[PDB]
Amino acid sequence: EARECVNCGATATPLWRRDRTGHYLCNACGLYHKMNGQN
C-alpha cells in the first residue's frame, strides 16, 4: 500500500524509515539496518 519493503514486505508498519542509501524500510527492517550497523 504505502511502499514495498525489501526485507519482509509488510506495508502495515506504523512508520517508514529511509536508509542512508535512499531505500524505504519499515519500523522493523529499518531498525535492523540501524541497530546492526552493517548492511
Binding site: 511502499r3 514495498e4 525489501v6 526485507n7 514486505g9 536508509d19 542509501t21 535512499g22 531505500h23 524505504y24 524500510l25 527492517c29 548492511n39
Partner: protein, 36 residues
C-alpha cells in the same frame, strides 16, 4: 547483445513484486538471501 538492463521488477522465487527498481536492489540483498 544480451539484455544488460533488467526489465523485471518482480522476483520469481520470492514472488514479491516491486514498483521501484531502486528498492528492488535491497530486496535482492536480503529477501533472496544476503547475496552481493
Amino acid at each position: 547483445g544480451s539484455l544488460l538492463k533488467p526489465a523485471r521488477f518482480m522476483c520469481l522465487p520470492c514472488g514479491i513484486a516491486f514498483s521501484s527498481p531502486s528498492t528492488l536492489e535491497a530486496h535482492q540483498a536480503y529477501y533472496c538471501s544476503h547475496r552481493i
